[PDB]
């Protein structure tokens, strides 16, 4: 059951706000460093990639691959990110659509959205991507952070993934640990 | 002050000793048990703070044997003779599979129990006399992976003829593979293993 995960991290100014380690990207980044390491500890047959949502954009940061050191070095460099601009889910799902339309669909394609639950600022109606990716069968599971956004709920309910929000950093580990195991 | 463990596995195949009962050099069962005795006695001869444990994997079970230097080794000797007699009175891949499962869980227990600075190295050795069959591919594999994920070196020695899974154990984990024709020569080279390949695998050989 081979997976092709693009972890979508957020870079809004919700990463200036605390209730975690000194900036939320620090906790999220550190536990993504754990996530990469455990995701190759469990899933060598799969492949990951970092997409960082930034300044109403999304930016592909590491390709869909099976070489962990590049991922972790990308994390090390994304440590000191200023996190300019409110995010955008639309660009992240567009990037995932582009790069993942070409993969063979006998395998599960989830996409992990680590979204900071800030206002979903998009130039185009994401409801239409929620229409398309249903038929495409690319799955999407989303972990918000400190709030429940309605649109992520509709996203995670039509796509068929899982949504969750987090208080304890121990609980953040609980949920990343849940997403480690391969969903059917 | 490396709180160092050593764990050993011995086959208990009566078919294999029936093979080794018509031979010309004719090392006995008790010869190999004395070999392992000397292995353990040598590693505890190294320092007080070193501990150790040995199994003999029974056809039906696996019972472990573990222990003023001389008296420590003598208690070990008596324990070893007693459960070796128990194995010879109470009697293929199942034996040693379930034994290495016991082994890892006993490493878990010995690690969880007595740690003070939580400092440790849980090195394990394996001696398999006969072949190990692929009727349980998943179990053996799983155990090797659990051994790697516990940061444990697995060394190994084969006596009669080669098996796949032991070679693959050696490969995946990071401990050496061994097979020597002449058998007391292999006993003293196990002694060379327990000394160098256990302590200072570094600049040795």
């Amino acid at each position: 059951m081979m997976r092709h995960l693009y972890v979508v991290v957020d870079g809004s100014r919700t990463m200036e706000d605390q209730d975690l380690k000194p900036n939320r990207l620090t906790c999220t980044l550190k536990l993504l460093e754990y996530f990469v390491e455990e995701y190759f500890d469990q899933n060598p047959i799969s492949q990951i990639g970092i997409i960082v949502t930034k300044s109403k954009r999304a930016e592909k940061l590491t390709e869909l691959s099976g070489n962990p050191r590049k991922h972790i070095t990308s994390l090390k460099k994304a440590v000191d990110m200023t996190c300019h601009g409110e995010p955008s889910l639309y660009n992240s799902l567009s990037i995932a659509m582009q790069t993942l339309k070409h993969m063979p669909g006998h395998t599960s394609r989830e996409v992990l959205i680590i979204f900071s639950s800030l206002t979903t600022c998009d130039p185009s109606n994401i409801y239409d991507l929620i229409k398309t990716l249903k038929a495409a069968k690319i799955r999407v599971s989303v972990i918000g952070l400190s709030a429940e956004v309605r649109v992520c709920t509709v996203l995670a309910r039509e796509t068929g993934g899982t949504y969750h929000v987090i208080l304890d950093e121990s609980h953040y580990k609980e949920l990343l640990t849940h997403h480690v195991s391969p969903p059917p | 002050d490396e709180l160092n463990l050593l764990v050993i596995v011995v086959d208990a195949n009566p078919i294999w000793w029936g093979k080794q009962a018509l031979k010309e050099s004719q090392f006995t069962l008790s010869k190999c048990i004395d070999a392992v005795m000397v292995l353990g006695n040598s590693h505890l001869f190294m320092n007080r703070s070193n501990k150790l444990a040995v199994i003999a994997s029974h056809i039906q079970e696996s019972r472990f044997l573990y222990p003023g230097k001389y008296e420590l080794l003598t208690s070990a000797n008596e324990v070893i003779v007693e459960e070796i007699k128990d194995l010879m009175t109470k009697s293929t891949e199942t034996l040693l599979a379930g034994s290495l499962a016991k082994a890892l869980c006993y490493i878990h227990r010995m690690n969880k129990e007595v740690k003070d600075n939580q400092e440790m190295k849980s090195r394990i050795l394996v001696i398999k006399a006969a072949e190990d069959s692929a009727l349980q591919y998943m179990n053996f594999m799983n155990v090797i992976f659990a051994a790697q994920k516990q940061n444990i070196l697995i060394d190994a020695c084969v006596l009669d003829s080669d098996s796949g899974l032991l070679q693959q154990a050696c490969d995946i984990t990071g401990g050496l593979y061994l097979k020597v024709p002449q058998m007391p020569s292999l006993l003293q080279y196990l002694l060379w293993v327990f000394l160098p390949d256990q302590d200072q695998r570094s600049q040795l050989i």
């Binding site: 206002t119 998009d122 994401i126 400190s146 309605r150 649109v151 929000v165 208080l167 | -």
Partner: protein, 724 residues
């Protein structure tokens, strides 16, 4: 008995409550914990009483207060119909009549798309029973109101229509086979089970709209969301009059003079013959829809008398009595509108000293006005309506004013100079409009999501056997969080106790709260304000000063405006902006109509802020006449009823937030004055179960941390609840 799943439980409560209201034939006051689908339980147990008969005569007229909620009631009982129509197997017929008169009327394209209701229905009735009743058969004159004649045909016949219909069900049937809402409403009033319509339709003594035949043996009526009973009765019987309106009336009188002069015999000989027929026998000359298009009864339990036409011999002299009435009345108006007065019998008795005839033509001016145009049957209703207003006023002033008042107020009501003069004639007895509704029926049920102080039932004065505060536990751990926001830190004046808008540091703390509120809270926020003009002040200090853009850094403002168009635009934007990526807070006014009907459900607008106190502004003299007549009831009331109506506005606004148990409810009172005022008016179950453990003087930032904890712990879980 319709559970369809396992309940809150509420049917465990309202089953026993309704069995108590139906054993003892009595009135009753219910209270809804707002997460209840009160509609489901009420409609269900009422239908359970419909299909049984411990009493053989069994009715329901059920109301609501907004035209969408009518449709909401409909669909939910369509669901109710469906379920144990399937379960009970063999189907027995049904009817629920949404009786919408005004804007849900006409299928003719010439008539329909003119915007208002009343005037265009005047064009409709002028065509039907004024042009095609006078010119009773013509090609060009009698226009194609063809399905009124189809009503003639099937009103001679007997069909049986199917079940409860929508509003648009009857327009689609208009197209196919059920044509007029009015006339198929008549034929279906002839036999119906449940009739649902608007609350203003049933209690309106400007034009007393007799709904059903007043068959006083057995009759069951339920008032839904029934909070503003007093203000409905008052505004349904008060009458306002403007001097501009009076000058349109004077132009209209000169127009009627022209029409009287240009008619020499024919309609007037018709009047003479029919008036001889009326002297010979007291008869209803228009049995059909004209009396429904007339001002029916400005005084309902007062008689349609015997001494009809007391002071008139012919038309133009009674017209001269109206001319005297208007000229003397504008004389009255100028000489009194010098300085505002308050008097019930002084104006009527002094006019009885000025105008010749006293108390009989005052008692018949409405009917004689309507009948003397009915014999003419030429004047357009749009051109005529302010004279209808006048005769309706004089009829009221005639037969009623002892509990009523007259108040005449020709000056500023937040305005420029004396160029808008106007009077008001209101009750203050809420009894004199609800007493009909009690005395007619077997039992009515006042339902409320809000009515916590049951000690201010006696503004209605009546008698009431079933009166309990509904208790319903919430194992969906905490459905609410009231969180009252009085600054410890920045030294709260969040109450507007200086004046309405005499200071603005008040408003700057409000904007601090709003920005941090929009920082935390998702999905749009429903921001209730104090008044239009205070919201104008707030928004002025916001969009002028340092605030607003950081809110506009986050989300979008939907600022209400005093039309229905801007209500529509901001509402459409609110739902379409919260069902997408964006928050976009609404900010409205508490007494503005956005509260009634909209139902901010959990998908959008899930954290309702009250800002300020929803008190009606405390110095106005209508309110002083009100509180003096209720100081004629209890003498403590001078601040007590103010706090009462402030609380019913408050909870009516705030307690829309929740539709179910499994639902997310914040409600935060950015106020100071809410200590004992919300240990009065918030629901007592809600103060006991969910409210103000230690939360009274919450600094905003403490409020934000309480909000974070609440949102995070409502967003963490869900499986298990009160499986009852």
């Amino acid at each position: 008995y319709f559970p369809y799943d396992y309940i809150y439980p509420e049917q465990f409560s309202y089953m026993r409550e309704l069995k108590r209201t139906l054993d003892a034939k009595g009135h009753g006051v219910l209270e809804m914990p707002s997460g209840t689908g009160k509609t489901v339980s009420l409609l269900a147990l009422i239908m359970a009483y419909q299909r049984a008969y411990p009493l053989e005569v069994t009715k329901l007229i059920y109301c609501s207060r907004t035209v969408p909620e009518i449709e909401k009631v409909i669909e939910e009982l369509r669901k109710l119909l469906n379920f144990y129509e399937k379960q009970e197997g063999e189907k027995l017929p049904f009817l629920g009549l949404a009786l919408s008169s005004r804007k849900n009327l006409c299928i003719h394209p010439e008539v329909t798309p003119l915007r208002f209701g009343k005037d265009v229905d005047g064009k409709c009735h002028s065509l039907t029973a004024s042009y095609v009743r006078a010119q009773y058969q013509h090609d060009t004159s009698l226009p194609h109101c063809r399905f009124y004649e189809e009503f003639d045909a099937h009103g001679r016949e007997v069909p049986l229509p199917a079940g409860i219909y929508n509003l648009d069900d009857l327009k689609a049937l208009g197209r196919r086979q059920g044509w007029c809402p009015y006339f198929l409403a008549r034929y279906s009033i002839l036999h119906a089970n449940v009739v649902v319509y608007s609350y203003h339709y049933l209690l309106d003594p400007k034009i007393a709209d007799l709904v059903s035949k007043e068959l006083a043996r057995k009759a069951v009526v339920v008032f839904d969301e029934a909070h503003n009973i007093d203000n409905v009765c008052i505004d349904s019987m008060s009458v306002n009059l403007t001097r501009r309106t009076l000058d349109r009336c004077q132009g209209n009188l000169e127009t009627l003079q022209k029409t009287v002069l240009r008619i020499k015999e024919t309609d007037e000989q018709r009047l003479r013959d029919e008036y001889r027929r009326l002297v010979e026998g007291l008869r209803e000359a228009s049995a059909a829809r004209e009396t429904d298009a007339h001002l029916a009864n400005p005084v309902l339990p007062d008689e349609v008398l015997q001494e009809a036409v007391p002071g008139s011999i012919r038309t133009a002299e009674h017209f001269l009595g109206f001319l005297r009435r208007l000229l003397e009345y504008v004389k009255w108006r100028l000489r009194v509108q010098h300085v505002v007065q308050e008097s019930p019998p002084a104006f009527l008795s002094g006019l009885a000293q000025r105008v010749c005839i006293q108390r009989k033509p005052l008692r018949f001016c409405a009917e004689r006005l309507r009948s003397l145009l009915h014999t003419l049957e030429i004047t357009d209703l749009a051109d005529f309506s302010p004279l209808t207003l006048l005769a309706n006023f004089a009829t009221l002033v005639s037969t009623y004013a002892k509990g009523f008042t007259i108040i005449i107020e020709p000056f500023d009501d937040r305005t420029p100079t004396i160029a808008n003069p106007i009077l008001h004639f209101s009750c203050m007895d809420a009894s004199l409009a609800i007493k009909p509704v009690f005395e007619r029926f077997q039992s009515v049920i006042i339902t409320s999501g809000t009515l916590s102080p049951l000690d201010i039932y006696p503004k209605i004065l009546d008698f009431h056997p079933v009166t309990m505060a509904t208790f319903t536990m919430t194992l969906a751990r905490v459905c609410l969080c009231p969180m009252i926001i009085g600054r410890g830190n920045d030294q709260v004046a969040i109450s507007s106790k200086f004046e309405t808008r005499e200071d603005i540091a008040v408003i700057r703390n409000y904007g601090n709260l709003l920005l941090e509120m929009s920082a935390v809270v998702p999905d749009g926020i429903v921001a209730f304000f104090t008044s239009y003009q205070y919201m104008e002040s707030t928004v002025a200090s916001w969009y002028e000063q340092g605030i607003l853009e950081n809110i506009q850094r986050n989300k979008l403002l939907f600022i209400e405006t005093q039309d229905g168009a801007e209500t529509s635009v901001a509402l459409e934007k609110y739902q379409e902006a919260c069902e997408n990526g964006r928050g976009a807070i609404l900010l409205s006014v508490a007494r503005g109509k956005v509260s009634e009907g909209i139902d901010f459900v959990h998908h959008y607008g899930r954290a309702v802020i009250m800002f300020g106190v929803p008190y009606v502004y405390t110095q106005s003299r209508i309110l002083k006449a009100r509180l003096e007549y209720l100081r004629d009831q209890f003498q403590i009331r001078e601040n007590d009823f103010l706090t009462f109506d402030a609380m019913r506005h408050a909870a009516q606004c705030v307690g829309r937030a929740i539709r179910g148990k499994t639902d997310y409810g914040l409600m935060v009172f950015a106020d100071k004055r809410f200590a004992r005022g919300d240990k009065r008016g918030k629901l007592p179950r809600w103060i006991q179960e969910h409210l103000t453990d230690a939360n009274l003087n919450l600094t905003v930032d403490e409020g934000v941390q309480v909000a974070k904890y609440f949102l995070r712990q409502m967003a963490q879980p869900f499986h298990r609840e009160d499986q009852l």
